[PDB]
């Protein structure tokens, strides 16, 4: 009764979007605004702090874009944190802060700007930007790229922001998206921000849940229970981790249990292979014959 829509003309005239837009992964509007560089700064690249959250991991990368593809400068993942002493809550706002601090320290070590631009060595939660030192190189400038993730006051991407800013990178930002920002009275409550930096919210949940719902405390905070980690010593886990991250921010790759060839040979066993033209012609001939 109604016209069939998916005609051959519909498919012929359909213009498919960009591959990574159809994947729903790249916002090319924002990407153009982030990447495009002043034409009189000819080959000087703009550096992005790409911050992406998965269900289990925090990915922070410093990236510059080129015609053949993006090039990673350094990268810090949340699963590197256990090396530094954070094994649980690998997606906290505080885990985000630690990852941002780690990527900042690693980038500055790679560049050579360690003694200059140390950052906020005494984290009190105050809003601060990395100021340049007179008669010295300017701080490494990086712009935050949160991708498709929504901008909300209290979001974890700005946790990675705050960690990277305190780590010595100059990343331009405002404090009105941090946890503890009073929108009515436009000032930042640094006490609550420091709480979030050192897992204060998580510790308060532990304390509030333990005396109200012990069974839920046992299921949600199992790993802490078998690790004998209470609320009062939650903060120290981060406070030490910070210090260790500043002590040795260098990247240590995981020792690989197999070689590239072994990985490839194992994976190739589970990969279906395309039928040859002759094979599918033979299948067609067989189906015709069995159709008589």
């Amino acid at each position: 009764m109604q016209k069939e829509f998916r005609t051959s003309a519909y498919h012929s005239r359909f213009q498919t979007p960009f591959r990574r837009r159809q994947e729903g992964k790249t916002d090319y509007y924002q990407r153009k605004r982030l990447v495009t560089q002043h034409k009189a700064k000819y080959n000087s690249p703009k550096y992005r702090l790409v911050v992406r959250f998965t269900n289990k991991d925090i990915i922070a990368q410093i990236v510059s874009a080129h015609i053949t593809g993006d090039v990673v400068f350094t990268a810090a993942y949340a699963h590197e944190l256990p090396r530094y002493g954070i094994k649980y809550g690998l997606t906290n706002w505080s885990a985000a802060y630690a990852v941002g601090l780690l990527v900042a320290r690693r980038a500055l070590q790679k560049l050579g700007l360690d003694e200059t631009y140390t950052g906020v060595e005494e984290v009190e939660g105050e809003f601060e930007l990395t100021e340049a030192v007179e008669d010295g190189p300017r701080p490494f400038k990086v712009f935050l790229d949160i991708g498709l993730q929504r901008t909300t006051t209290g979001a974890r991407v700005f946790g990675v922001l705050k960690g990277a800013s305190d780590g010595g990178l100059y990343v331009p930002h405002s404090p009105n998206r941090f946890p503890g920002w009073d929108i009515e009275a436009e000032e930042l409550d640094a006490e609550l921000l420091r709480k979030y930096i050192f897992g204060g919210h998580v510790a308060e949940y532990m304390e509030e849940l333990l005396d109200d719902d012990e069974e839920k405390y046992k299921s949600i905070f199992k790993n802490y229970i078998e690790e004998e980690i209470e609320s009062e010593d939650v903060e120290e886990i981060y406070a030490n981790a910070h210090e260790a991250i500043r002590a040795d921010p260098s990247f240590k790759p995981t020792e690989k249990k197999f070689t590239k060839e072994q990985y490839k040979a194992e994976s190739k066993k589970y990969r279906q292979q395309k039928l040859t033209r002759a094979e599918r012609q033979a299948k067609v001939a067989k189906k015709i014959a069995e159709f008589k």
């Binding site: 005239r13 359909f14 213009q15 979007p17 960009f18 090319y28 509007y29 990407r31 153009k32 990447v35 495009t36 560089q37 002043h38 034409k39 009189a40 000819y42 080959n43 874009a65 080129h66 015609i67």
Partner: protein, 159 residues
Amino acid sequence: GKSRGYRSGTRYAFQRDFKKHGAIPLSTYLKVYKVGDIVDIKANGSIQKGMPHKYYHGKTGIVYNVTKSSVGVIINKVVGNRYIEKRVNLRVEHVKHSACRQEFLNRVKSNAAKKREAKANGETVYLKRQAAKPRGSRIISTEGNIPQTLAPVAYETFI
């Protein structure tokens, strides 16, 4: 009433290519232009800022100025009995590097390499390009290729 507006007659010139509408791929914004570069001008209809006039659509020129998002291009236009130097400000979406530079610069590199190697081998080489010359003599073998005789065909109607 005659109409001679800025974009008159650009109905097809300023159209996007079929199945090529929408966002600009970012290699356009990643290319680097220096003063003295030779660039083609091709208006992109989806960017209306910094758009060239229809005369410069399809022209090639020299970059003379580099600004935040644009380049200044020098074009020579015939006005009566002489050329006038025109200075056009174009956003980089309407600009592309000219491919004639890389070919001539490659012939320069190849000539330098051939001349130095010929000097190393102690011989001489001629570097001037040559037009296609008439072909030389040749012998056509007919083993397996004995000439087939054709004739004009009679008239037929095929409808």
